[PDB]
Paper text:
Macrophage Migration Inhibitory Factor (MIF) is a ubiquitous multifunctional protein and a key player in the inflammatory response and innate immunity. MIF has two enzymatic activities: an evolutionarily well conserved keto-enol tautomerase activity and a thiol-protein oxido-reductase activity that is mediated by the C56ALC59 motif. X-ray structural studies have consistently shown that MIF exists as a homotrimer. Each MIF monomer consists of 114 amino acids and is composed of two anti-parallel α-helices packed against a four-stranded β-sheet.
To elucidate the role of intersubunit interactions involving Leu46 on the structure and stability of MIF, we compared the structural stability, and biophysical properties of wt, L46A, L46F and L46G mutants at the secondary, tertiary and quaternary structure levels. To understand the role of Leu46 mutations on the three-dimensional structure of MIF, we also determined the crystal structures of L46F, L46A and L46G huMIF at 1.70 Å, 1.70 Å and 1.60 Å, respectively. Similar to the wild type species, Leu46 mutants crystallized as homotrimeric proteins with dimensions of approximately 35 Å×50 Å×50 Å. In agreement with our previous structural studies, X-ray crystal structures of MIF variants demonstrate that the Leu46 mutants conserve the same three-dimensional structure pattern as the wt protein. Static light scattering, in agreement with the analytical ultracentrifugation data, demonstrated that wt, L46F, L46A and L46G exist as stable trimers. Finally, crystallographic data and enzymatic assays do not show any drastic conformational change of the catalytic site or activity of MIF upon Leu46 mutations. Using hydroxyphenylpyruvate as a substrate, we showed that all Leu46 mutants are enzymatically active. In our case, chemical shift measurements demonstrate an extremely high similarity between L46A and L46G huMIF, whereas the L46F mutant exhibits a slightly different chemical shift pattern. Thus, decreasing the hydrophobicity of residue 46 (via mutations L46A and L46G) destabilizes the hydrophobic pocket and results in distant structural perturbation that is transmitted through the backbone, affecting the tertiary structure of the MIF. Taken together, our data suggest that the intersubunit interactions involving the residue Leu46 play a key role in the structural stability of MIF and provide new insights into the role of a novel intersubunit hydrophobic pocket in modulating MIF’s conformation, stability, and potentially its receptor binding and biological activity.
Numbering used by the authors:
A (entry chain A), B (entry chain C), C (entry chain B): 1 to 114
The structure:
């Protein structure tokens, strides 16, 4: 799985250790070994949510399965909880788009997962 | 809905006001209150379109419905028009990918839109 | 087609000519005309792969067709090979997400490809 966060929160306000905490909590949440989890955090962005430039986040989670109704509500509570705790962003100023990827449409290591 | 613009136009050429203008124009165009519209503009990117580094943009528009053949033509005319007028980019150097997102695959406020 | 690369490799390690090589090789692999190929490279990113901050990349390839099982394995071989040779990134620290885009869902030049 791959988790990407784009935020207007400044780089100085992203705590040390955040990439590792995202990797650990996503490995646990998805029930996958951490060797499979990629994370990416992009601060200092020019973005607005509902016309306001108060802290906000636009994020994505891609996974080959383990995506769906109840699972996504659980991911949202975990990930908004981390973004509120670590980056001080309110949960109602966060969007996370979930993508169930087909194994044939994920490349890695010169081939795909198919 | 969520609109993202990535462009090689430099940061000083993006007008103050452009994020607000996009928020209002998209609220009008999607029929959704502006409180729901998230916008994000990333200038200074290393990109090319047809091998050329003339001003160009790679964009995406995600919405829970309000996505389809004739709606997408109208969004492309609206959004290319804003990009040409404000960032001086040729409409034929712009790509906009449209995503009709399932409510259960958009997280927000600790849960999803389902 | 559009190919995006996000990486933690520093901007100074991305060689001159990389965007043009990706454009040409993408045209060679997809058979699509170079004039319509877009490429985008984002270095200096805060990202981890498998809990490690060794060089890695998260990428995406969008194309209106020319996407599927055998084609995607071929693209992964080509693109991991360019990232290893030019950015010194190990192929097993690269993810590439592939998207077969509906022509109606790709805006360009005030309209769509539908």
């Amino acid at each position: 799985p791959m988790f990407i966060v784009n935020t207007n929160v400044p780089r100085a306000s992203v705590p040390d250790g955040f990439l590792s905490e995202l990797t650990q909590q996503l490995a646990q949440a998805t029930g996958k070994p951490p060797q499979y989890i990629a994370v990416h955090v992009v601060p200092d962005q020019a973005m607005a949510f509902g016309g306001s430039s108060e802290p906000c986040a636009l994020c994505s989670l891609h996974s080959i399965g383990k995506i769906g109704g109840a699972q996504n509500r659980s991911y949202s509570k975990l990930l908004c909880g981390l973004l509120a705790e670590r980056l001080r962003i309110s949960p109602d100023r966060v969007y996370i788009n979930y993508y169930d990827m087909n194994a044939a449409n994920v490349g890695w290591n010169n081939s795909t997962f198919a």
